[PDB]
Design a protein around this ligand. Structure first.
Ligand SMILES: *[C@@H]1O[C@H](CO)[C@@H](O[C@@H]2O[C@H](CO)[C@@H](O)[C@H](O)[C@H]2NC(C)=O)[C@H](O)[C@H]1NC(C)=O
Ligand SMILES: COc1ccc(-c2cnc3c(cc(C4CCN(C(C)=O)CC4)n3C)n2)cc1
Ligand SMILES: *[C@@H]1O[C@H](CO)[C@@H](O)[C@H](O)[C@H]1NC(C)=O
Ligand SMILES: [Cl-]
Lengths: 497, 494
């Protein structure tokens, strides 16, 4: 319906400029006839999820790259895609005028946008908070008599989550994760640095901490918000490092295993929130398969664990096959879910690089690899940040798919937004990854899925400078003859019989 | 010979204060007696005590049994890097303070280092950018020369280190970047590799640069044990990599070694210098070794695999070192650089950190238990900010120099390193050591070239662990490993 208003900030590609009266959007889906396909294309040169259509041919003659669909080779079912409602993201969004806020929320959550169906919600403060706090800061309040949600929840996160669900196309799943417990429950008495819960699983400290999760879920339920899942701790391995600068709570895999079995698992199961899923790990995949083996070989722990949450930061050091692949081989019934990702955190990195095609490609390469290795969903970090990549109470400034410019009542949709949308918009919950084989070695990243209705979706990413002529074969429909231009991402859709 | 002058900076343990006139220093018992060197978080610094080895042991307590006929790798040694930053910090002290610092590391009154890693020109731990051949398009390397960093700082200091050492010291050289006129991006840093392809003028000139370097240091009466093919070759593959780098995929390194580096070094008067591959994060193994070592032309020139160790990464060594040794048992593994943190993010100095000490010793034990022949620390000395560094990529070091007080601080990392370096001479062999029951201790047993035993025991837990060490030739060693302690046991076997 409305095209991208491009703006170059001097980096490799453009951003799309939005404000109080204008934002780029899509028209409702059309249903292209059997024997034809739809293509959505984004390019470094500036195209942003542009729609084209073409024929599917009965025949193909050539020696070129062929990608063959194998619809009978079934893999994982998709849960979804989304991002995090941090204090920083909520503050930024709400500092825009109300019409600009609605266009930003529609961009992410509506069918006119990219159809997010996951919101990650931190349990109290984390680095993208402007201050440190927990829900139970009165010291030694073991009964949690003074447990309460501050304005960060009641005035910022909760109102925005309600507005996102009201605008959403699809049912939205909320995921909760804690960074720190109250300081009086920790060995170091501080929100950050090396420290774990005091004592041992089954004791007063571990029982209070598990009850805090029920109190959190109760408080959100009083605000008409229900969670799909909770993680056992955000980055539990971070709390084992001396000088760790952000809110954390250290758990070795044995400690996580025992806390789940003795405290979190039974406390959750014996509450009105027993249907809420529990995800373990919520950390780097380099900790796999070892962390899954420690937790999931204990049946008292394994019985409470629905899935394994992974963060992307060490993916370049942890081959997918040895980590995700081996974890799936060992525990095929325990889903793998990517729960956090952001660019810009390395020591020399510019926090925000308005229009970076490289940062968009990093997102789509990650999503594809994860989908090729049994992962059921992918979650971005901050839904929005300012042009400095904040605010943040610890000067850790990073990038985000949407950058809010408060002084201009304007927001910018980065290449990451569109790279993520090439998946989120076209792969609804319940879609299933299917086989897709290449005829020869190639430089493309591709994945194929089938929608619940039987229609096909193929995402093709080209991270090379060269155009790659390509054919996609559906054994029941035919050959989709195409070209994957250098530095492009395409999403192909087509009806099947 | 002189005890630790402790000082706290608000961290878990103390540093040892040294100055122009004072520094803590050191001084084998008869068969039937053992020596114990203990360091504790509470303040003990490689304290010597002795005790009996008894013929009999009755009990159900933890038993570590020495397996002398189970022989593993032989040790090359231990040391650290003489970066520009290390040399500037050391030379900032008055000459008597510099000598106590150098004796701390290299003398027998110190911790007996026998390895010095020498960067070939600038890196991040430099105060400026430079190479040895910055005059453009000098393919014959006629304008190749060593600057002040080598001739006034590094070379005189290495000479002073070798004078103080009783053990032969091995030098190891590594380049960060080539001259920029040999690079695809024409820059010291960023994503860029050598121009063209192996066998050509660019690759030939770069191979010749290694020989010119070895020739230059040979004129300064310095010979090298080994060179690495490139410091962290994966770095120059990253867009916007912030400091000195030269990118190589494993395929490119394989072909440059096979076509240029290997033949050039073999045809030169430095043909005896060993060539080490990878010189990057151990997490890149086994993939990197599989690519290079499966090519016979590359395999004939590669002596070993140099690995880096960033201590914040929690990963199983069996997957990297273990699998690499299983695939290439005749290719030695050597740790060429280790330091705190996670490479790509930021850190600060923690004066007196016992946690960082424990990271070092836990890492050395892991390496030795997984066939690694040596362990090289990064910068030998840093200032209190963990510099100087031209891109602010600060990190901790075992020795911190405070110019304003003409003082230097010896960190727990120094002593954790010393529990190995001082007691494990070159030629020592790792031997089997078996635990009777599952435990919280990190332990390694080695045999000195003379047959004597050395056992290092690290206790990372808060609890005191009683234990017995069984040697079938001498008897039993009855001891206690206190919480947050590191011990080195020594005893004659005959
Ligand atoms: C919000 O963004 C829109 C889109 O860029 C702006 O609309 C343009 O405004 C100029 C000046 O009035 C017109 O000449 C263009 O034709 C408009 N473009 C479109 C596509 O309508 C709008 O002005 C911006 N609003 C603010 C307050 O900056
Ligand atoms: C003081 O300012 C700052 C302090 C710290 C920061 C800052 C920001 N992002 C960071 C880090 C460390 C990591 C890594 C380390 C390696 N990993 C492990 C071992 O699991 C994964 C996580 N990330 C992603 N530090 C930024 C700014
Ligand atoms: C050097 O250290 C020793 C031991 O602590 C002390 O006695 C002496 O006064 C110090 N010298 C200076 C110049 O500070
Ligand atoms: Cl590493």
């Amino acid at each position: 319906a409305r095209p991208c208003i491009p703006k170059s900030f001097g980096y490799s590609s453009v951003v799309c400029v939005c404000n109080a009266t204008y934002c780029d959007s899509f028209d409702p889906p059309t249903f292209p006839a059997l024997g034809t396909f739809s293509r959505y294309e984004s390019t470094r040169s500036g195209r942003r999820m542009e729609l084209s259509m073409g024929p599917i041919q009965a025949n193909h003659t050539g020696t070129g790259l062929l990608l063959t669909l194998q619809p009978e080779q079934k893999f994982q079912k998709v849960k979804g895609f989304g991002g995090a409602m941090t204090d920083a993201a909520a503050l930024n969004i709400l500092a825009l005028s109300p019409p600009a806020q609605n266009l930003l929320l529609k961009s992410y959550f509506s069918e006119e946008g990219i159809g997010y169906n996951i919101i990650r919600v931190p349990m109290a403060s984390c680095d993208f908070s402007i201050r440190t706090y927990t829900y139970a800061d009165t010291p030694d309040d073991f009964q949690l008599h003074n447990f309460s949600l501050p304005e960060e929840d009641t005035k910022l996160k909760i109102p925005l989550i309600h507005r996102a669900l009201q605008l959403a196309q699809r049912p939205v799943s909320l995921l909760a994760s804690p960074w720190t417990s109250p300081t009086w429950l920790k060995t170091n008495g501080a929100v950050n640095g090396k420290g774990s819960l005091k004592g041992q699983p089954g004791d007063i400290y571990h029982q209070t901490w598990a009850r805090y999760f029920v109190k959190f879920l109760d408080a959100y339920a009083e605000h008409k918000l229900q969670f799909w899942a909770v993680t056992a701790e955000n980055e539990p391995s971070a709390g084992l490092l001396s000088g760790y600068p952000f809110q954390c709570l250290g758990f070795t895999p044995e400690h996580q295993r025992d806390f789940i079995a003795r405290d979190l698992g039974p406390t959750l199961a014996n509450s009105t929130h027993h249907n809420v899923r529990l995800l373990m790990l919520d950390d780097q995949r380099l900790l796999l398969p070892h962390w899954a083996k420690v937790v999931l070989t204990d049946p008292e722990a394994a019985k409470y664990v629905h899935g394994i949450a992974v963060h992307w930061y060490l993916d370049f050091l942890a081959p997918a096959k040895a980590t995700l692949g081996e974890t799936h081989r060992l525990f095929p019934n325990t889903m793998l879910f990517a729960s956090e990702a952001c660019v810009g955190s390395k020591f020399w990195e510019q926090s925000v690089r308005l229009g970076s095609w490289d940062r968009g490609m990093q997102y789509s390469h990650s999503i594809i690899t994860n989908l090729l290795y049994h992962v059921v969903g992918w979650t971005d970090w901050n839904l929005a940040l300012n042009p400095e990549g904040g605010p943040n109470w610890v000067r850790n400034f990073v990038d985000s798919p949407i950058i809010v410019d408060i002084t201009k009542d304007t927001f910018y949709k980065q290449p990451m937004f569109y790279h993520l949308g090439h998946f989120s918009k076209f792969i609804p919950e319940g879609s299933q990854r299917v086989g897709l084989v290449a005829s020869q070695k190639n430089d493309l990243d591709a994945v194929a899925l089938m929608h619940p209705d039987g229609s096909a979706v193929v995402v093709v990413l080209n991270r090379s400078s060269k155009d790659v002529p390509l054919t996609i074969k559906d054994p029941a429909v035919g050959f989709l003859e195409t070209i994957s231009p250098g530095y492009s991402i395409h999403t192909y859709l087509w009806h099947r019989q």
